[PDB]
Write a protein that binds this DNA or RNA. Structure first.
Ligand SMILES: [K+]
Ligand SMILES: [Mg+2]
Ligand SMILES: [Mg+2]
Ligand SMILES: [Mg+2]
Ligand SMILES: [Mg+2]
Ligand SMILES: [Mg+2]
Ligand SMILES: [Mg+2]
Ligand SMILES: [Mg+2]
Ligand SMILES: [Mg+2]
Ligand SMILES: [Mg+2]
Ligand SMILES: [Mg+2]
Ligand SMILES: [Os+3]
Ligand SMILES: [Os+3]
Length: 74
RNA sequence: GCCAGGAUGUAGGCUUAGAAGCAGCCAUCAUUUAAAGAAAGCGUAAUAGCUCACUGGU
C-alpha cells in the first residue's frame, strides 16, 4: 500500500565502494574497485525497483551504472 | 498519411545556484522488449510538455 523506494544504484555503489563521488572521466579515471559479491547485494536490494527477470540481469544494469561513474568490479 | 506505443536502473557520472535525454565535461552501459538513443529537435529557471529516431497496426 505504501511505496518504499530504495536509493539510486549510483548512491548504493558510492556507499559500497566507500567514496563521496564518481569519476569525472569514467573511462580514464577509475576511483574504486569493488567485488561482484557486492554488485550482487545491490541488485538484490534494488530488485523491487528493477524490471529484471533475474539477478544476473539485475547485476548487468547495476554494473552498467558502475561503468558510468568509474567503479571497477572483479 | 493516419492510429498506438516510444519504456525501466536513471535526475548516468562530473560539474553547476540549478544542470533531470537536450549550458559545458567525461562516458554511453544494461534491463524489459515487437520496438524505444544514457537521445536528433522545440521547450523549462530547473522540472513538465511536444516531436524525432525505433516498433506494431492500417
Ligand atoms: K542537462
Ligand atoms: Mg511520405
Ligand atoms: Mg532511461
Ligand atoms: Mg544528478
Ligand atoms: Mg538530486
Ligand atoms: Mg569548478
Ligand atoms: Mg522526463
Ligand atoms: Mg546529462
Ligand atoms: Mg521524452
Ligand atoms: Mg536544457
Ligand atoms: Mg507519432
Ligand atoms: Os504520446
Ligand atoms: Os537495446
Amino acid at each position: 500500500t505504501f511505496i518504499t523506494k530504495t536509493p539510486p544504484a549510483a548512491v548504493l555503489l558510492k556507499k559500497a565502494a566507500g567514496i563521496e563521488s564518481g569519476s569525472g572521466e569514467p573511462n580514464r579515471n577509475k576511483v574504486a574497485t569493488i567485488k561482484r559479491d557486492k554488485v550482487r547485494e545491490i541488485a538484490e536490494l534494488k530488485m523491487p525497483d528493477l524490471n529484471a527477470a533475474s539477478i544476473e540481469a539485475a547485476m548487468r544494469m547495476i554494473e552498467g551504472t558502475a561503468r558510468s561513474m568509474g567503479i571497477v568490479v572483479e
